[PDB]
Amino acid sequence: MFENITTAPADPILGLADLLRADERPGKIDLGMGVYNDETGKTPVLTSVKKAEQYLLENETTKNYLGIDGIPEFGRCTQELLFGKGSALINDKRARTAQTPGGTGALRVAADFLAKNTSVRRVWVSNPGWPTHKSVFNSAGLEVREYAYYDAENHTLDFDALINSLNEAQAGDVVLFHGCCHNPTGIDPTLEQWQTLAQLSVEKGWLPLFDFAYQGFARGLEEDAEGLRAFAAMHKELIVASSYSKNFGLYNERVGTCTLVAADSETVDRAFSQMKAAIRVNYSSPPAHGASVVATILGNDALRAIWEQELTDMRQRIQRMRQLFVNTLQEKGANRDFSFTIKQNGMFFFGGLTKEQVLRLREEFGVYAVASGRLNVAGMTPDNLAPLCEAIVAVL
């Protein structure tokens, strides 16, 4: 049965993990996968989280099945984070959320949902973008088309190119938007641009699909949801896949959600029934632990206070690191100007390096980054900043 099977191609991002574990050199600087590191170069578990886990260990009495869509309180809390405490979608019961195994799991159940219950044949994704989007949608049978987005030689959102390419999108097809902290460019549209996109979308008949994996890492919780809420205010239907992996540092606990929005509750319920079917035929119900932690925190005023401050400190350390990065580079005498880095939202640095420069970086200097020239700034720390910059200056 398995004699003819061929080796699968390695993942451009997740594959870095395996490359790293095979390298014996001690001074390896890992700036690949987008995980947050503190000043000591460790990706720690939040205090609010530890406190919640303490509470769960003491108050949890059963481990019984969670119900297809997961913890109800968890879903309600996520809707408020996404649409605002007094949103119309929430009041008119137009939204239904399913707890899922991470944001990726959400993209998968959405894709399966779309493929079997809708006439969507193709999904539109940006370029530059996130590799996993194409894999996920192609595996569900949907065709993936790319739209223009980044202005390389200027380092800004090529808004005219964005609309010109999107003119190709027909009514009925899906358009994938990054909520905030665009992976990998870090450049997001402004509120006015979001509004333009929203009106153009409603008018053109596209089914919007938001991938929200970095809420709170750009400006803040509420501000980062601005674009989404703009679309939510004009749209009748939409899908939003969110993740709590990064803003709660619950990476391996696979905590995410998939929210469906329809014209009314009758439609959303009828639709959600089919999304539950897609889920039940996959993993049945979702892992409780991570979601319980989030609900506990999000539901306790004291805990939420600690958590938001921790989120603030993470965003602040990254902002400090990129400003320090640019500085140490000029300090080391980099021939190219990387000041544009400071305008990027999120955890990454994108735009300066080529496929070969990053290859040389890992080979000669043991610095690991993605082949697209994307570096995880959150992996940068005061102690690795100098060696890291010396490596980069030698490769420019």
Residues making contact with ligand PLP (CB under 6 A): 34, 102-104, 130, 183, 211, 213, 243, 245, 251, 256, 284
130 belongs to the catalytic site: yes
The answer on whether 374 is annotated among ligand-binding residues is yes
Distances in whole angstroms, Cα of residue 301 to Cα of each of 86, 298, 306, 319: 18, 7, 9, 27
Q: Which is nearer to ligand PLP, 243 or 384 (CB)?
A: 243
Give the one residue of 90, 159, 283, 340 binding a second copy; rule: CB under 8 A. 283
**Residue 153 contact, options a second copy, ligand PLP, none, Cβ 5-8 Å cut-off depending on partner type:** none
**Residue 42 contact, options ligand PLP, a second copy, none, Cβ 5-8 Å cut-off depending on partner type:** a second copy
134 belongs to the catalytic site: no
44 near a second copy (CB under 8 A): yes
Contact 330, 233 (CB under 8 A): no
Torsion of CA 224, 226, 227, 232, to 10 degrees: 130
Distances in whole angstroms, Cα of residue 298 to Cα of each of 49, 250, 307: 11, 14, 8
Q: Which is nearer to ligand PLP, 125 or 389 (CB)?
A: 125
**Residue 213 contact, options a second copy, ligand PLP, none, Cβ 5-8 Å cut-off depending on partner type:** ligand PLP
Q: Which stretch binds a second copy (CB under 8 A): 1-9, 176-184, 224-232, 338-346?
A: 1-9
- In 3D space, the residue among 35, 227, 210 whose CA is nearest the CA of residue 133 turns out to be 210
379 near a second copy (CB under 8 A): no
Strand partners, 376: 348
Q: How far is the CB of 44 from ligand PLP (least distance, A)?
A: 17
Using CB under 8 A as the criterion, what x/- string covers residues 97-136 for binding a second copy? ---xxx-xx--x--------xx-x-----------x--xx
Distances in whole angstroms, Cα of residue 97 to Cα of each of 120, 253, 260, 271: 21, 18, 6, 11
State the catalytic residue, choosing from 51, 69, 124, 130.
Answer: 130
**Unique residue bearing structure tokens 């450049």:** 187
The answer on whether 4 is annotated among ligand-binding residues is no
Q: How far is the CB of 50 from a second copy (least distance, A)?
A: 7
The answer on whether 130 is annotated among ligand-binding residues is yes
Q: How far is the CB of 196 from ligand PLP (least distance, A)?
A: 23
Instruction: Give the DSSP H or E segment for 391.
Output: helix 382-395
Q: Which stretch binds a second copy (CB under 8 A): 39-47, 121-129, 153-161, 211-219?
A: 39-47
**Unique residue bearing structure tokens 């000041």:** 339
Query: Could you give the count of Cα atoms lying within 13 Å of 135 in the half-sphere of its Cβ?
Result: 12
**Residue 34 contact, options a second copy, ligand PLP, none, Cβ 5-8 Å cut-off depending on partner type:** ligand PLP
**Angle CA(102)–CA(107)–CA(113) in degrees, nearest 5?**
125
Q: Which is nearer to ligand PLP, 281 or 305 (CB)?
A: 281
Q: Which residues 152-211 are close enough to bind a second copy by CB under 8 A?
A: 172, 207
**Could you give the CA distance from residue 137 to residue 47 in angstroms, rounded to a whole number?**
36
Q: Which residues 334-363 are close enough to bind a second copy by CB under 8 A?
A: none
The answer on whether 183 is annotated among ligand-binding residues is yes
Residue 98: phi, psi to the nearest 5? -115, 125
State the catalytic residue, choosing from 112, 246, 276, 307.
Answer: 246
Q: How far is the CB of 284 from ligand PLP (least distance, A)?
A: 5
Total Cβ atoms within 10 A of residue 331: 12
Q: Which stretch binds a second copy (CB under 8 A): 56-64, 74-82, 211-219, 220-228?
A: 56-64
Give the one residue of 22, 24, 40, 62 binding a second copy; rule: CB under 8 A. 62
Q: What is the DSSP string of 247-306?
A: TS--GGG-EEEEEEE-SSHHHHHHHHHHHHHHHHTTTSS--HHHHHHHHHHHH-HHHHHH
**Could you give the CA distance from residue 372 to residue 355 in angstroms, rounded to a whole number?**
6
**Could you give the CA distance from residue 83 to residue 281 in angstroms, rounded to a whole number?**
29
290 near a second copy (CB under 8 A): yes
264 belongs to the catalytic site: no
Binding region for L-aspartate = 34, 130, 183, 374
Question: Mind telling me the catalytic residues?
Answer: 130, 211, 246
Binding region = 34, 130, 183, 374
